[PDB]
Amino acid sequence: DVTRIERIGAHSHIRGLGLDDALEPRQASQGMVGQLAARRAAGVVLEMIREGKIAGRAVLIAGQPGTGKTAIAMGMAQALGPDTPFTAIAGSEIFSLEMSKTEALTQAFRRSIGVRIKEETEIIEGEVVEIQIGKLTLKTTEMETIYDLGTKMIESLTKDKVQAGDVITIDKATGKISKLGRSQCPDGELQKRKEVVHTVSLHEIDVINSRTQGFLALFSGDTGEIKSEVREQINAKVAEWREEGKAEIIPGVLFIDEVHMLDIESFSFLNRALESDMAPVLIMATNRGITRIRGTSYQSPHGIPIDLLDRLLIVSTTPYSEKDTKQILRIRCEEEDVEMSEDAYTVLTRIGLETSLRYAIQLITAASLVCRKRKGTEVQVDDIKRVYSLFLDESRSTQYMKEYQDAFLFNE
Amino acid sequence: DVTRIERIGAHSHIRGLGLDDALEPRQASQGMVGQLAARRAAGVVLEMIREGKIAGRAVLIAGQPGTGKTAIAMGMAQALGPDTPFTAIAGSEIFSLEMSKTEALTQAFRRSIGVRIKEETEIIEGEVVEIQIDRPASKVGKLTLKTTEMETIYDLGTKMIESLTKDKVQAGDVITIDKATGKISKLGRSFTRARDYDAMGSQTKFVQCPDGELQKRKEVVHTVSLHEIDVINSRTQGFLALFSGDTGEIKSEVREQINAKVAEWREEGKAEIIPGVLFIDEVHMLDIESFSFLNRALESDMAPVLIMATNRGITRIRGTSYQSPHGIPIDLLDRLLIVSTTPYSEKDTKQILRIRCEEEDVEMSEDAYTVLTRIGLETSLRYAIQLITAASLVCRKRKGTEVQVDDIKRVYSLFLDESRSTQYMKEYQDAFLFN
Amino acid sequence: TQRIASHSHVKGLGLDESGLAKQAASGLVGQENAREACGVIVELIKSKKMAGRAVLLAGPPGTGKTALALAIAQELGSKVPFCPMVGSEVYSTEIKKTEVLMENFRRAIGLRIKETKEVYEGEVTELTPCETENPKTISHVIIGLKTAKGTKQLKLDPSIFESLQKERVEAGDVIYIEANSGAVKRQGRCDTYATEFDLEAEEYVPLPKGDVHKKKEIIQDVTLHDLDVANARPQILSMMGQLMKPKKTEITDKLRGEINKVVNKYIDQGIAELVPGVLFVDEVHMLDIECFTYLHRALESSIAPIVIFASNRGNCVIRGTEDITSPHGIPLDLLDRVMIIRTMLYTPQEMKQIIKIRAQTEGINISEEALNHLGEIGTKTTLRYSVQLLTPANLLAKINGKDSIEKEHVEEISELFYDAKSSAKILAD
Amino acid sequence: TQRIASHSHVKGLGLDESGLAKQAASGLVGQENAREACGVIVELIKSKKMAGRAVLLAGPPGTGKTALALAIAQELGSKVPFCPMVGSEVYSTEIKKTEVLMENFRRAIGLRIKETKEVYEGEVTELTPHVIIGLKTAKGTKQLKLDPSIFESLQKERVEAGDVIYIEANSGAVKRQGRCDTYATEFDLEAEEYVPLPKGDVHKKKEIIQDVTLHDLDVANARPQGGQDILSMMGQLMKPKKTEITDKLRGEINKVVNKYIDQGIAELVPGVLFVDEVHMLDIECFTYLHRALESSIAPIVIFASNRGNCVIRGTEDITSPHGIPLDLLDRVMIIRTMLYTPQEMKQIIKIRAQTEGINISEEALNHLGEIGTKTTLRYSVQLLTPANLLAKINGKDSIEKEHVEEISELFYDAKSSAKILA
Amino acid sequence: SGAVKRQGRCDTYATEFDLEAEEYVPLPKGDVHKKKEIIQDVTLHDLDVANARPQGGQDILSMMG
Amino acid sequence: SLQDVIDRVAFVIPPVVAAPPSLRVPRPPPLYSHRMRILRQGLREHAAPYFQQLRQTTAPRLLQFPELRLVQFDSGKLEALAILLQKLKSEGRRVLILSQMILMLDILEMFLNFHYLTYVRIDENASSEQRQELMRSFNRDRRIFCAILSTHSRTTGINLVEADTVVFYDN
């Protein structure tokens, strides 16, 4: 267990929203720090999602860069149960060359609504004793039984060579036989009834039923503009399953990070998409102030037209204070297993307030590396100064670019 | 005499750069006139290409219109020969609906790098003097070949019998058998079929009898560009896309695999790299994305020598709002050498007109040469060149032998240059659309 | 053919033997200097010496630029390939603009293939093998062939026995045998053995006419673009290709070079003869900067045809550029590679001559006073407008039971239909 | 000798044990601060702990940004993935910009999988129609029962008794490589190629280590080439084309790779993505890169930019310090490259001459340095090979000052050409 | 239309074997011959897309489609 | 016309190959299973006349064996032996190659097959009767150009050898 696929990213320390049962946000809990009002609002939205009764609710997280909006979204994803879908896309991902923008938004919406289907099946698992072709003898460590074979079951056992001593499992309803080795023999009952629960998103249903071997389009893409008739027929069939009790609907979350990259066409589509009864809870994040909407000449409070802003509730994220910045640095250091002296913590907090929080987070790893090079054990002020000298922030880099403006290309 | 596919084009008189051993250009050699500095630079660049040791060297030929930039490029191509690849594209050719601009530039670069493969083959070559095939109704057979030096009787396997039957090998055929794969090729017949056979209506010439040993160890040289290798390896039916051009964006992993195996083939004895030239005429039609790709593309070890031409001065780079020399960004201009061409004089223009008359096979008087040189200096070199052909036609219409001044004045009056046409357009501007 | 088009009266450049343009001949009136220069261009095309030479027809609308190009085409005949194009056609959705241009270039280079086949065809009357002692052994296969002219016996090579049984040739079967390969091909039972009571279609064929042995010459006309398309995508891969849409492809220069080599080999062998022709590009000002730049290189190729450009835009901004104006919407770089032929506005007399020729071609009887009135209308308005009034006035006259147009009919048709300028006047008000 | 590229001299960063840059080591000259920063970045990459950390090399043109990036690539080694790319390559005609970025992110994550390859090899004896075929080798003969798919593969190879075949049961691939050398004397002339009998066992298991990217697994599962079944074969006829791989597929590949790492039969090797001309990306790509770099899977990404305060592609009037919007400049560490002094230029020119096999005298070197004080460093370097060609033509084995002067008279620089045009 | 659909095996034979990979469906309850007047709502667009491309064809080109 | 130059150049194998993902369901619907079954049946029935063509035009290139050219080029001794054998064959001579290593004899076998030379191998694992049979076959069949013998084989049982040239590959 070394170098797993999941490594330490920007939001690895966030394990939840860090809220009490009253949704009161703790100052530091589950990796979160400060943002008390916005975390409380995120918890209310999370409770809305868990209830799942209301459809088409939209929430926008707004604030300055670095104020923890994506962190709040990641915390809401972590706190939300893995059973409930949570689709997270960037706003630039809808500009596909294989489908229209409205089609991409439709697919993203349908990926955020899950259909949970439970069904029972009968599974036979045991050790083969004798096979005659037909008759089949199976035994466990506690019981033994002989079965009379059918023509199709005889064909299934002939295609997959099964002999005495093999340990195999057979699906009673389908005859699917898979050999798992030769003989530990199974202990309990030979024939068991198992319920299995699959959660299938509406988009998976649509694509699976779009064409022969359509499920391959769930993996490679290649899903064209799915016909509206198929979607309507599936919506009706799913409603019928909900009425009959064969399936339950699990409403989820679609998160569009940096939604300001959407154009007026996409926003107009979102205006009507959130009005369906199968619409999920939409969460958006944007740092833009009053700025021009892509595809138009009109400026809007968040690059989002006021039509859509009227369909959503806005959550604001404040700047952090010195204490919150220091606590975030501590949690990031704990996440990265970096030990720093208290003076180093103070210097890094001052740097983060002066220049940027992300700059301080990066300097954590840089200083850890510089300390490891010098055979150190705890990061000192000298290492923070060294990494501050080696690596520039946007402000200092800009000042140097102004100092040597004559050497740069297309400088203005 | 006969009208070939290739006719007299705008550069048919260019046979090379016209240089000596010291790369000092001659005044008039190999169809080149003047451009001494530009031709010396082109010779140095051609030596740099032929040495092949340096990759991604870019040279830009910059000058006024009609000063011989494409002529110099064609001279370099002629002096390079067919062995070394020389891919010439218009800059507007990269804007494709089948592939991205960067993919097009990659395919252009990879087309300009030859891979010269070598393999040894066992070849049987001789005259069929007797062939017997016996089949039921397995096949058995016996084949005897002669080569003046020896006569050997072979006992034939089933696959060789099938191949010989398919090729319809008959006695008196000079054939070649590739022992590595059994492919049978017929070089020709050595004597007629029996005269007693009707039809068979042919009396084809008979090739001379082979000499030496029947079986020889023959080394054969096959040259393919990197683009051909890429397209062949891109898919199961890739070779069909080499002609139709239906090549999508070839996966970069396949290109890396090919670059690695080609490096192995050149560490082994299997292949030799022949790096060539990519000539992007009118390079100012490239946009900022293409120049930015060219910046990194020239840093590859498999990059060829890139030659570029443009007449634009400080102009706006396509796709941007910035003005730069030659319509090329300063970042790419830093990565290239600029060669400048100078406007011609009276003597150079007269010599060019003489060479064009010689290639067009137009006899023309010295007074006609003087008036045409004056016209070319006044209007343009290409206009005078086109008046050569028009005046030849007018002279042949009147049953004359030598193009005189009257013919040049006639064709000058018949066909206008840009300036006189522009003046007449301004004189009748209300008749033209949108003023 | 049968229907009457705007250029159906243009039958060629009305040039004399001395190369001068007659005042009115072959349906063309005036444009003497432009017809003479077109004559020199026609001689250039027929000379086949030069490649890539460009000529620009430039002048006001309705000055015969397209008429002069189609007159050049008529002078060149139907043997010379003349490919009309309009600049709007380069904006294809399947292939790049430079591919459309190169394809139209190769369409204007013709190739004439000459195939001479020797065939022995007739109804089989005997298939007797010739037994012999080997120095059962057969040394020849005698086939007797019958045609309406007579009967011939052929001493064919014994190896043909395999093909005879493969083709299931029997007595009374019509066959043909090619001289070179010696392989037999069966084409059905002779129709002399067909009864009216049996049902088959392909298996019966009439007895061949002519001599049993025939020498046939087959001449086919193709373009280099035809060969390009044929070799780019030959006709289960065929099943998938025919099911899917067969889009145009960006044919590579490799294929074109190989095809040039093959055509040169044919010309050396004498099988083929080249007929280089003309690509006519009307409304060339619709091309964009990338197309004009490509044309710079294309016109410098030794393989290119002679191209005829036409423009009327005057000093106009080049398409695909911003504020870059040029004398004809064509960059000055391309204009240095083209000869320009100016076309001039017509006099009222020339307009009357053109109107009369149009009326003749349309089969319309026009009175002298009606012709004068329509000419005077055409000195106002435009020539095209006055020509367009001809057939509606003829129909109006036919309604009124008149076999010829009277002035009153011209007046009424003018009162019904308006020109661009009258409509602009109405719009302004 | 291999062809000499623009960055051929660069063999590494030339850092001492204490991580400080030597003035002239490993081909690099000067740029001590930037080499040290790239040192810390190389250590970060080797640590394999941090995902998605981005660094921006920002400086004037010709100041070593690409050379530093390739020095990092050399210091990492061939084991660590390194995916050089250009921002202009994201403008694919087949797939969206975000798919190209994601595919490049996945290319830079490597995976060494140890796979057990079981191979059946020998000379075929019997091909009884499931098929009970026999194989014979230098050791002995075995009888084997195989799936009908393997029989169809044998028929595709047209295997006949007496032929030597190689069967990889893992991939179901059969390679008929010849007829046994025993039969090689039966006929005086045959169309087939003969090969010796195999010397080993009929059934052999060999353990091999395969290096693949996560992108390789993604593309293999997206467009499968291993179905060997009717529908998959009919699909393989279709024209190949890049496809917008979904997040579901990448998640499934992530789970499979996690299972492999847990079983110990695979090792994951995070590498580097290098985007040379990041200013060629548009605002959509930068917005996607925001989310992409925050992922726990992303590799270490290195960016280069030589732009001043210029307009961000895809926006109207938004200007940023390097063409990168301020939101992405906050997520990256910036390394500044400074202009070269004339002495550093002379050292770099000498190194380039020594890499190109060119001998240059002290006076010629000084004249070339002076030329480099004007113009640019690249231009002064680019005069080396033309001048050496003229030296060889003039019968000298070293560049002299006269050859440098002649080449500078033959070839003009960007500034001289601009002055001529103006 | 003469279309025939085999909707499984009769449940009376569920005990003919102890392990068969078959789908048993109950015996129909009503009469053998069943009549029912029905209505279906379709749009003209549905007819358009049904006739846009052949479906249900046994020919190889229809199978590829 | 490219076939020969195509096969010399087709060498890229994909780094990863995988069968298509298989949609797994409990209780698959009878209608879906029947539709897939008849679809596959129809495709196989229509493809049967063209099945081998589909197989060859779709099957990917998974394996990459080292070219037989490399055996000769990796050893200078094999190159000098190739030149010597060519010279001796032009003179119609017969050659005996002796080597101490069995694996070297196997490499010599691959080398001779690459040169299309007929050979007989006599190692120590061949019984005395087999050794005599092989040597008698070599003497009888004048067409066998080379005989490769292990120096560790009991050559003392071979009295007569109708060969005039002996090559010691290794000492």
Ligand SMILES: Nc1ncnc2c1ncn2[C@@H]1O[C@H](COP(=O)(O)OP(=O)(O)O)[C@@H](O)[C@H]1O
């Ligand atoms: N309240 C918080 N508690 C813990 N970490 C935080 C908090 N807010 C931000 N961060 C961390 O600081 C960095 C920047 O925050 P982020 O959410 O990326 O800002 P943005 O809203 O611009 O996306 C991230 O590493 C994030 O995990």
Ligand SMILES: Nc1ncnc2c1ncn2[C@@H]1O[C@H](COP(=O)(O)OP(=O)(O)O)[C@@H](O)[C@H]1O
């Ligand atoms: N030095 C020269 N020697 C011979 N012919 C020349 C020379 N310079 C130009 N020409 C000819 O004059 C014409 C000028 O066109 P071109 O060389 O393409 O100029 P540019 O490419 O600079 O626009 C061409 O026909 C060219 O072959």
Ligand SMILES: Nc1ncnc2c1ncn2[C@@H]1O[C@H](COP(=O)(O)OP(=O)(O)O)[C@@H](O)[C@H]1O
């Ligand atoms: N000189 C002429 N003689 C006879 N008919 C002419 C003449 N000029 C133009 N026409 C005819 O009048 C119409 C003018 O159209 P066209 O020649 O296409 O003009 P444009 O130069 O605007 O393309 C056409 O029907 C043409 O055939």
Ligand SMILES: Nc1ncnc2c1ncn2[C@@H]1O[C@H](COP(=O)(O)OP(=O)(O)O)[C@@H](O)[C@H]1O
């Ligand atoms: N510090 C250095 N030492 C040695 N060679 C260098 C150094 N910096 C750049 N070069 C070389 O000079 C040329 C300039 O390239 P480079 O400066 O890397 O381009 P950029 O940094 O603008 O992308 C290349 O050949 C590069 O290898």
Ligand SMILES: [Mg+2]
């Ligand atoms: Mg964010």
Ligand SMILES: [Mg+2]
């Ligand atoms: Mg030119």
Ligand SMILES: [Mg+2]
């Ligand atoms: Mg017209």
Ligand SMILES: [Mg+2]
């Ligand atoms: Mg760079």
